[PDB]
Structure formats: structure tokens, C-alpha cells
Amino acid sequence: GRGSMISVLFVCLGNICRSPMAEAIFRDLAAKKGLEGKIKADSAGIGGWHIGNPPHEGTQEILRREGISFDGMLARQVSEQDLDDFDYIIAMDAENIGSLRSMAGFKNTSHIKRLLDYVEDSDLADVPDPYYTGNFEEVCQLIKTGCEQLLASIQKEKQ
């Protein structure tokens, strides 16, 4: 539209469960708002065990039932450069925040926030890691509402 494309990076630990789910859901929400030419999403993980792999089967199953594509999505590890490239860096939990701030040397981190920061009220602050819980349904609900509220916040602030 007017000016540069907005970019959003979702960050979790493995970049196989949470952040890919968020990337795909957010992308789908944006597409439906007709914003695909104005906002772009990616994800990445703090850790590197899963680099190059498709999302966890649990996340694939969730997305499939939502009818959301995830073709071509494959884990990658966040880098320092990502901090400069992306307008919004959206962590899943407090551990991820700690990782990102330390990577940034505790400088220029105002754009690094948790997904549930965008959900007013909200009992939870963290999206739990289902690699450990097994609870992909809970994650899906938390990520859906978080993405809806994040998109609205970006839509407001940037247009």
C-alpha cells in the first residue's frame, strides 16, 4: 500500500510446534483480511535440533483440521540479523524472551514481545511448549486468539 512491507517473526524453542502454528495461522488471518501484499510472516527457533524439518506432526494435524496450509515451511534457527530485519518479534514464552534479549545484548528490544501480551485480560502469559505437554489443542486456542489480537494491533498501529 503506502510504504514498506511489515514483517512479523514468531519465535519458539524448537520452531516445530508453536511458532510454525502461529506463522501459518497469522498468515491465513492476514490473507483473509486482504493484507497479504502488506504484511509477511516467518518463524524461527532459539534451538537448532530441528533445523530444516517440517512442523511437528501435532501441529500439522491442527493446521490440517483448520484447513490451513503449511507447505514449504521448515524449521530454522533465529539469528542476530533477524532482530534487525523483522518489525515485530513475537515470542511464545518468557524463556524465548530471555533468549532473544540476551542475543540482542539487551539493546534495541522494544519490538520483542510475547504473543499473549497482545491479548488483553488473558489468564496466561506463556504459550506452553507442547513438545513437552502433548497439549496441541490448548496451544491452538491460545495461538488463534493471540494472532487475531496481534493482527488487529498491527492493523491499528500501522494504517
Looking at 66, 87, 117, 126, which residue binds its own copies (CB under 8 A)? 126
Residues 77-116 that bind its own copies (CB under 8 A): 93-103, 106
Residues that bind K ion (CB under 5 A): 43, 76
Tell how far CA 3 is from the center of its chain.
23
- H-helix or E-strand spanning residue 44: strand 39-45
Cα(25)–Cα(19) distance, integer angstroms? 10
Distances (CA, A) of 108 to 27, 59, 114: 26, 32, 16
Q: Tell me the closest approach of the beta carbon of residue 93 to its own copies, in angstroms.
A: 7
12 is catalytic: yes
Any idea which residue has 530441528 for its cell?
A: 50
When the beta carbons of 97 and 151 are compared against its own copies, the nearer one is: 97
Catalytic choice (17, 93, 129, 147): 129
Residues with catalytic roles: 12, 18, 129
Site of interaction with its own copies (CB under 8 A): 13, 46-47, 93-103, 106, 126
